[PDB]
Write a protein that binds this ligand. Structure first.
Ligand SMILES: NC(=O)c1ccc[n+]([C@@H]2O[C@H](COP(=O)([O-])OP(=O)(O)OC[C@H]3O[C@@H](n4cnc5c(N)ncnc54)[C@H](OP(=O)(O)O)[C@@H]3O)[C@@H](O)[C@H]2O)c1
Ligand SMILES: NC(=O)c1ccc[n+]([C@@H]2O[C@H](COP(=O)([O-])OP(=O)(O)OC[C@H]3O[C@@H](n4cnc5c(N)ncnc54)[C@H](OP(=O)(O)O)[C@@H]3O)[C@@H](O)[C@H]2O)c1
Ligand SMILES: CC(=O)CP(=O)(O)O
Ligand SMILES: CC(=O)CP(=O)(O)O
Lengths: 286, 284
């Protein structure tokens, strides 16, 4: 069964590699075609546009960053997804997007007799390549049941929360906690270095004692490797912080949340959109 | 025979695990009634540091605050330093200032005894399951002598010989705990205000990469309707204050400083012995 895939960024490429590794036939499309080259070498089929992709595939994955990509891929007249879908098609959107955007796409797909599956993921490039991503899934149960065995190829945990927009709500809150944990872990590692502590002992303690977190692991991996990419850009991190910022209530202060939004915005301004989320390390020391 | 001093939340749990292994344990505590349930489990009451040292060549200590360091170690004639025999070992499970641990290492060595600086992590839950993590500083011969004892209630033991080093690592680890905890509570509270159910947030915040040991703490508090996490605001701020005193003058650490001020505010509003998770109520 042929599956399509749009968005060959860091996460998209990694999920595609996992699908190819299970011997799924995969047709791939990206705005920047050079990011398909390695996938093509490994058996993927290039689709130059959404028309060609939808001809071949009745189930498609989307893994892009930003609201402009939502607009271009879904709503471009004649050329976009909504114009090319057939009745019974399913799109599994793995992007992190605003819940109201996801809700609107659920409704637009239903009008066409197709199904939007809202499927944000967590686990990074590393989890994609090992096939152990966590998915949060909103959408209708029959379409979910049909694509569920596909998610199994690259996911370990899948949380089905049917209400449209609910998966994105949970993902954005998950990533706010990532951002707080990451900034704290970088501060704690940095202080330890200034205090004379060796990275090996800090890694030993911060993975075994209860300061441990998934993103402490990220920060330690970054420090231990001398800056090997965590494969999350500040552009992607700040996109999610901005989604969270727009959901902050006017009646209660959340200082750690608001600090995380401002902190990574400043690091983005100082280091550039494509630089690593962990570049807070270098900003911290100035 | 093992002695144990300090039967607070963590001490009682470690003692329970020691006793479950059928080790002889003699216990002492300032507040006598905290021993009764340990004695029901086979512990032997020691009225005295003197009585404790007469029975045991290896003593555990598990107290909170610098006043307890002064009262138990430096009491003239009656304190630990006066009662120690050559060859004795005191295994201190408390979180204290690194310079305090350094002084005790030296004071013990000059009594011909050994101070083993052994802060732990895992909470009461981890102690009862015997899977605490330990960070250990001190001399290798004494460390080797007490390592099999640690194995009764620990799963991981990180040996960093340099005196003061285990406490430096503990304090930093607990700074990360405090930041993670505050963040977890903010995220859960916002989720509730946005109409997400706790069950969904628990499924996601444990499987996705916002997960952490203290997110699990915050979730268990909310799912249980406020059952104790067995860490008081007094203990949490004790460790934050030890971190504050180690901040440099020339560099800002905003999340670290926010954690210190936030939990101070919670402590002041909710009381020394209230749960560290009372940040939930300050946010309500
Ligand atoms: N990185 C992670 O570890 C991770 C983990 C969980 C979730 N995510 C989510 O996965 C998605 C992708 O993240 P990434 O890290 O892969 O981002 P990325 O590496 O920056 O790739 C971004 C993708 O979006 C496409 N895109 C952006 N603007 C576009 C436009 N105007 N028109 C067409 N295509 C456009 C890019 O196309 P070009 O290649 O032509 O620029 C690229 O395919 C995001 O929603 C992110 O939140 C990432
Ligand atoms: N999850 C945890 O609770 C946890 C995990 C890791 C590390 N720790 C560390 O473990 C140690 C104990 O924590 P806890 O949570 O068990 O605190 P706790 O429940 O408050 O017990 C504190 C202990 O200190 C004793 N104490 C305090 N001041 C004293 C004094 N002046 N003279 C004599 N005894 C004194 C108390 O005696 P009374 O019983 O007479 O008050 C009690 O036994 C702390 O250093 C803490 O940082 C705690
Ligand atoms: C930014 C992002 O979603 C990365 P994650 O896999 O959740 O760590
Ligand atoms: C406060 C404290 O040290 C508790 P922990 O076991 O590290 O969570």
């Amino acid at each position: 069964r042929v599956v399509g895939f749009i968005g060959l960024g860091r996460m998209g490429q990694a999920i595609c590699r996992r699908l190819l590794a299970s011997q799924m036939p995969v047709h791939v499309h990206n705005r920047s075609r050079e990011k398909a080259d390695d996938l093509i070498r490994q058996g993927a089929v290039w689709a130059p546009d959404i028309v060609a992709l939808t001809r071949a595939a009745r189930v498609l994955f989307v893994c892009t960053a930003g609201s402009e990509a939502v607009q271009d891929f879904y709503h471009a007249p004649d050329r976009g997804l909504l114009a090319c879908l057939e009745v019974g098609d399913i799109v599994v959107d793995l992007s992190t997007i605003a819940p109201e955007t996801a809700e609107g796409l659920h409704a637009a797909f239903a009008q066409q007799g197709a199904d939007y599956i809202e499927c944000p993921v967590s686990g990074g490039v590393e989890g994609a390549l090992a096939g152990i991503l966590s998915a949060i899934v909103s959408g209708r149960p029959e379409a979910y049941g049909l694509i569920r065995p596909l998610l199994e190829v690259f996911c370990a945990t899948v949380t089905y929360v049917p209400e449209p927009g609910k998966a994105q709500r949970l993902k954005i809150l998950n990533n706010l906690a990532e951002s707080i944990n990451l900034a704290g872990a970088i501060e704690v590692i940095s202080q330890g270095l200034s205090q004379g502590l060796d990275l090996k002992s800090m890694a030993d303690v911060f993975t075994s004692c209860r300061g441990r977190s998934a993103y402490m692991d990220v920060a330690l991996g970054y420090a231990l490797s001398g800056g090997a990419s965590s494969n999350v850009s500040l552009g992607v991190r700040c996109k999610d912080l901005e989604l969270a910022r727009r959901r902050l209530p006017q009646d209660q202060s959340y200082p750690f949340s608001t600090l995380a939004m401002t902190t990574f915005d400043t690091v983005r301004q100082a280091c550039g959109e494509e630089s690593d989320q962990c570049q807070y390390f270098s900003v911290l020391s100035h």
